[PDB]
Amino acid sequence: QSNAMRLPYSWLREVVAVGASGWDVTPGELEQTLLRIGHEVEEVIPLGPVDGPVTVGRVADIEELTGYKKPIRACAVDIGDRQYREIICGATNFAVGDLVVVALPGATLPGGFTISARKAYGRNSDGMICSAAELNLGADHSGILVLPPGAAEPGADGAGVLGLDDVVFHLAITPDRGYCMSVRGLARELACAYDLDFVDPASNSRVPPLPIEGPAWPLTVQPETGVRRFALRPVIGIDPAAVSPWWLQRRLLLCGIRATCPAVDVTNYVMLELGHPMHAHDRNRISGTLGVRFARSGETAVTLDGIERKLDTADVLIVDDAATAAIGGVMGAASTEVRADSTDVLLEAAIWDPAAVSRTQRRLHLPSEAARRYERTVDPAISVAALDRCARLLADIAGGEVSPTLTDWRGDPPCDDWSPPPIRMGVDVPDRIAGVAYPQGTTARRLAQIGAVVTHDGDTLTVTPPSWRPDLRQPADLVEEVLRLEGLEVIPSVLPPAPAGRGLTAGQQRRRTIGRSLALSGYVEILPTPFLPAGVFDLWGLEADDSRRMTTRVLNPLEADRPQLATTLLPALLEALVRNVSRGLVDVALFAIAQVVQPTEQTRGVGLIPVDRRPTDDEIAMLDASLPRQPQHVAAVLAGLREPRGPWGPGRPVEAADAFEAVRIIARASRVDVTLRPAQYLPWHPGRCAQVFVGESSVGHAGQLHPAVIERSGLPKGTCAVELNLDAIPCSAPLPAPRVSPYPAVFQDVSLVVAADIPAQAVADAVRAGAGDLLEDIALFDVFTGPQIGEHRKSLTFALRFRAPDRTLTEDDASAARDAAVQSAAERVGAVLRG
Amino acid sequence: RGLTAGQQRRRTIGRSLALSGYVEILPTPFLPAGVFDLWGLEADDSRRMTTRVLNPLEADRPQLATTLLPALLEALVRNVSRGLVDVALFAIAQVVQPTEQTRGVGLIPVDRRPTDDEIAMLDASLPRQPQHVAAVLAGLREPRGPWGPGRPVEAADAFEAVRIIARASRVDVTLRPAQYLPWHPGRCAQVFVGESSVGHAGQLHPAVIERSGLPKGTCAVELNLDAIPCSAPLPAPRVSPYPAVFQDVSLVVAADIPAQAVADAVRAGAGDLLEDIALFDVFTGPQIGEHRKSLTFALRFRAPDRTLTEDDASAARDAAVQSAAERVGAVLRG
Amino acid sequence: LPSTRVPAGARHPIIMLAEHVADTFIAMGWELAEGPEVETEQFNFDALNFPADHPARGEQDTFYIAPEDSRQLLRTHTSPVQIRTLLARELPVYIISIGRTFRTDELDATHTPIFHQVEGLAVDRGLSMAHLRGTLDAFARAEFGPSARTRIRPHFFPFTEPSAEVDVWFANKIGGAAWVEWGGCGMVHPNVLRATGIDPDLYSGFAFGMGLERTLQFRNGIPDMRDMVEGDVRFSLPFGVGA
Amino acid sequence: LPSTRVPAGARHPIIMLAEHVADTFIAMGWELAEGPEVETEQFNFDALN
RNA sequence: AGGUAGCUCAGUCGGUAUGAGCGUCCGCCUGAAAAGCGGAAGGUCGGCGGUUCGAUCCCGCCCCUG
């Protein structure tokens, strides 16, 4: 979690109470205040609680019990007043006299764990020595909690020595507030919320700056690496045996940082307090002058963890005469690493280019507490301040001597001002944006609390944001500061009057009609995944040059074997059909209305277009033309029983004609006419497949799927499918004016014999073309083959309804029209009147 | 705020009936002459209490419709007489039903806003004008084609039109036997939503059909939309991914025990493991016995957290059989 | 006896929720805008004021499209329709957009890599945060009832300044009436206006975006989001035909 | 071959014209109001001046 | 440690896949079902390769799950 920020409430209150003595607030109210100003509190963790005899003790002896597999030891502990207890433990991270926390019988630990005197192993175990995890204090259960020397005398209450009345807040800081990645930032924000005086913990008013009488180390810097400031200050003669005190290790642990040697513990404590990442180097291991430079084409380098990493030409690293020292603000190597062997250190305080750090730490796949903050910009004005704070805190704990020499690099031009350029903004600009009339002077006061100096000049403010707020660049940024501090809840709710809209487009309206029509006809909509099943087109047996194989590919799919984006909706539908069938739902009709992705040769990437102006019309056309074609398709699949069984009969299985009807349902919903012509197009059955035309434009296919496809894909037998390209179906806005004659109709039937492969629709069209205007309706109701007809023939019988517009049609008039239809079918499809 | 729930429902019912083959007509409010005498209605039938127009265009048709069926049946006869004999029509329109409280209100002064009691007076004085939905069917419900000879209109097609309207209204509906002219007394259901009657459906009475010159077997449905309550459900369906167990049960009951009552008894005993129940066979014959019938249901059992075993499903099936035995006297088929 | 020879189907509940959302804004005079699912990085990120080589962009859960240098992707949100609308239409603009969005989140009970968002955009003379709040309240009252209220609190998005998150309060909720996180919103960033040729000193605007699967989850009480995306007919059919 | 076993019906053209008219005004922020067909002379004439 | 019929599982440690259960199909039963008996169909034994005259078995690499 790169945006996380953990810290104890006691540390926050301490920094805030310096400027406002006696400030204290409940954790619930503090949570609501942080949320009101825009800080997500992900979790509020109170420490403990403990009850009963939970006191700090001193181990008197450790008679190691041998013979077992695990190193079990018996320990005598003094709980104060020289009243010794007998406890048994299996931890091996403490020696005689180390300070530990014990839980005597009668005590209770988090949570619901009452300590009792139980017999275990060869001795009596009336109590136990607790770990950080068992006390709800840390996240380490591998070893027992051992306090640093001199934390508290034996007998003190454990709830007070550990501060189990404290609460630790876990916050998720938005990426524009990197200054809140510290106690300095968060404490400043609270002073703004409660209108309190704030003393900056990185201010020189706390302690005077340490003296500078000369450079601390030879240092050359390349200008194009992007580093804005680099500081060095040595601390000579540290005691390796000395460790960090309890108040420092406690706060460090509560912030998620494990303590190691005191030279590194101060670098992490200062980083958490002020926000400036701190790195400790071993001055004894430094050889020659230090240099900041880009890497070579293949210059590898090992880190402190021993992993060598191939660097890029854009990586910023520090390197001396020997080998590489560290990788910018990512991580340091093992060359200058501080160990128990070290005694002389050289602390570094550097601001690195955020973009450079972001690229390197992301490509090398290793974030860090330092990298997360450098990615979000660090206040360069406090480099030496945090350095002097870090050197003084180190010499105080390890018993060293702060060297009065300091190296500082402020760029090729010695930058003295670290504040962003000033911003001009009208005084009432926050008022107009918020819709609230703020009291006089609210904007200037709020912008002062965040650290900006403002100068009034009529109705225009000149705001110079502080150096820790590089996000404040435009008047809009300043507006956000005023509104979030005043509270967004004061903003009223007025409904804006929108002009007369035009409603839904014809395409949006058609998408609804198709959904309603298919749903009413028994189809269940699914949301189709765009990631194709693995090897679906090979299961379909598609040719190598089938256009559907030309898929767009995702570099980082959730499933490695499914990176291709769907060029057709059928695989997703068939996947959902198999899912339903495998769950016992075998009579299923599904549909989907979604776009596909069809790249062409013109599909490619477009380089960044400047965003300081509107892109040109050719640039807009470039971006549109570069994307794969994404037309809207409608598709459906059917398996099992189309009509269920009931008291009416055994139901009816799905047939290819049901897919043909789904086409006509879509056509009717689209108010277009449609013709179906025979076609061979996988994955459809070559003898049960229609290609769908609107006019002379193909728009899709329908019918029963190929039996070989069905078996290879594990589909139900007889599965049918339809897929149409909605964008190929033209929009129609007809204005019918039907002729409704009230005169009687004449009913006649005609039986026509044709070759068995003459489509019935062609015969009907020929009949219609000859019958003329008197023909009102024609309907095929019988298709017959047999010995009465002849080989390779079939007989079609149509019901004809004739009607005149101005008179009662006579039988002779209708028969003349029928004979003309028979003549037409004879000339066009070779029909013969049935005899 | 857009369309009200009632306006939106009126559209959904129109779309649903139109997609199911029904053609909407605009029904005339002037009743055909002597229509209720053709129906053989009793003298005290509430439908005879009509509002009357003083100056109708046709002297013999001054009464305003208390039901939508006469107008629909008139349009059905018009289509049939013009050679269009396979016809399904529907209408969504108000009727006019005066009460004893229906009377005239004298002129209220218009130099000021009328009082609240004056507004209530004017509203209360008008005849009740509830919105009804109605439909009629004659001839072939499914036409003939290369698939087969088609299927004639049956009373079950009117029952399905009820369920189409119920689904469009997002309400559950029960059909109970009833005798209510002009419907066939043996092929007529009264439609309930909860315990509230909302209309009738089925095949029209053969005597009504002959006296009215209607096609044989004509069916009809009429519902009072305003009696159907509005529903805004928020479903959260249980979707178990575990395998289902399929079992069939064949139950013998008396011939006049409604199949829905047997299914409800089976469902009540099967418990939560029962996911779906479907009747697929109704059988009578010498193998069963006189005055009896045999119903066979397909049962699909499924557990929410485990693969259901055959024994677990059979225990649920046996409990359903016991429930149907106690409630409708069902006997397991042997 | 059972009479349904043609069993009813069902439009998807997410689609029906989208339709109700669409109808709500159409009845307020707004219109529906559209955009493709495979989108350029120009519109998904750059024109929306996302910084480059920065965690606010690189740590987005983005599906990138081959090749490496293509700057093509499955859109992580419907906000690129803001750019497309402002480039295609004359001011003033009052639109919503509803479509699929893609994140690299594993499918589980509360996450789905493919979901739907409703985007809102209003650009006009004199628009303020109060108009944003009036629209959210009307939006909430239409999707959750007359007792629905909205809460707004500061947040961050690169394309809004100020930025906020929208919480919703509706009666008959889960464990009683309480605040549920609903979506994000804010005033349109002036860099977004300048990237489309709009004078920020003359025109202002607000935008918002809510996920439909999330909305359907806490409104209806759907425990497992897998049921919303797997296409089991048992999940859809109880919602009705949707005609 | 013909495949439509359930022939399509039709909502009335006047009703559909009404629906389009309604949708037009709804998209402008207007709403639909209703009233009975059998009306008092008070509202049909007198209150209308 | 294992991968074995469509699924779920035993076996076979170089020269006829020994087998079950479910499922599927098929007969008995039922007007037709379910359930039950009865029988049948059903196995390059994980891919890629060696070794060998010959590999489910032994050797190399890799997919897969706990």
Ligand SMILES: N[C@@H](Cc1ccccc1)C(=O)O
């Ligand atoms: N685009 C944001 C939501 C958002 C839209 C518009 C303005 C602010 C926020 C998301 O996908 O989460």
Ligand SMILES: [Mg+2]
């Ligand atoms: Mg959030």
Ligand SMILES: [Mg+2]
């Ligand atoms: Mg800001």
Ligand SMILES: [Mg+2]
């Ligand atoms: Mg004739």
Ligand SMILES: [Mg+2]
């Ligand atoms: Mg004749």
Ligand SMILES: [Mg+2]
């Ligand atoms: Mg079974």
Ligand SMILES: [Mg+2]
């Ligand atoms: Mg079985």
Ligand SMILES: [Mg+2]
């Ligand atoms: Mg990313």
Ligand SMILES: [Mg+2]
């Ligand atoms: Mg063995």
Ligand SMILES: [Mg+2]
């Ligand atoms: Mg065997």
Ligand SMILES: [Mg+2]
């Ligand atoms: Mg065998």
Ligand SMILES: [Mg+2]
């Ligand atoms: Mg067999």
Ligand SMILES: [Mg+2]
């Ligand atoms: Mg086989």
